[PDB]
């Protein structure tokens, strides 16, 4: 606290309470006893635990009819209207587009859409496989996930 | 009857103005003027001004013929207190209060 450690008045003789400094947390213009520090909140996970959790959430997405394995999935032109019409023809609203070949044609025209996200098959995360309502995968992405999880 | 007459930030304490205002409670209006004329208080003149303002309001905006009129609900409730510093002995300081008072007069003809 910007301020000196000077005693405001004497220890004895005064009718007021004890006083050592103005920076103490019971005083005004000053504060927190145990102040927070810029600590790291990332906590350690094991490799086998994370891979088994990925196995468990894929085994759960199988039994909930939320996993839709399809053929080669690509858009013709870099237009969001084409991908929106293609997901409308497949009755798909809140999906996780997870492919094995991250091309520029699908990575560009999927960013403005809220419920549509395009991730790479190597850098997957559990919160997108659980949070999004459907998970549609390319067969090459299925092969890459089967190779990575092993 | 409506059209009340208040007086904000009167320069006197609420207690003595209240003791002046305890004389007139349900009395006649001309009798209230006759009481506040010869009442030897500065607060008596300061509330007689508000009473004459209420009489003028009553004969101006609403149901006149002051002959049929009664001072129903007068009340003096305290207001803000200005802070001042009065120097005293032994170096210590005391803090006197410049006290104000709100004076609301509710007059009615019925």
């Amino acid at each position: 606290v910007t301020g000196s450690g000077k005693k405001p008045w004497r220890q004895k003789g005064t009718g007021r309470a004890r006083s050592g400094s103005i920076k103490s947390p019971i005083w005004r213009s000053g504060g927190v006893t145990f102040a927070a520090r810029p600590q790291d909140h990332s906590q350690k996970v094991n490799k086998k635990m994370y891979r088994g959790a990925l196995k468990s959430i894929l085994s759960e997405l199988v039994r909930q009819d939320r996993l839709i394995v399809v053929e080669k999935f690509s858009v013709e032109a870099p237009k969001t209207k084409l991908l929106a019409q293609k997901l409308k023809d497949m009755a798909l609203e809140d999906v996780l587009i997870i492919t094995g070949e991250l091309d520029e044609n699908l990575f560009l025209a999927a960013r403005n859409l809220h419920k549509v996200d395009v991730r790479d098959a190597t850098g997957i995360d559990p919160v997108s496989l659980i949070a999004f309502d459907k998970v549609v995968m390319t067969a090459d992405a299925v092969k890459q996930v089967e190779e990575m999880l092993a | 009857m409506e059209t009340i007459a208040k007086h904000r930030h009167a320069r006197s304490s609420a207690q003595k103005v209240r003791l002046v205002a305890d004389l007139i409670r349900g009395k006649k209006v001309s009798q209230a003027l006759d009481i506040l004329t010869y009442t030897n208080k500065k607060a008596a003149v300061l509330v007689k001004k508000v009473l004459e303002s209420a009489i003028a309001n009553a004969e101006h905006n609403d149901g006149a013929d002051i002959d049929d009129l009664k001072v129903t609900k007068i009340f003096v409730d305290e207001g803000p207190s200005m802070k001042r510093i009065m120097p005293r002995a032994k170096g210590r300081a005391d803090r006197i209060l410049k006290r104000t008072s709100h004076i609301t007069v509710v007059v009615s003809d019925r």
Binding site: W9, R10, G13, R16 | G91, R92
Partner: peptide, 14 residues
């Protein structure tokens, strides 16, 4: 107040 004085001595009682 900025300055609180020394109090008044008491009965000796020593």
């Amino acid at each position: 107040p900025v300055y609180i004085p020394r109090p008044r001595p008491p009965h000796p009682r020593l």
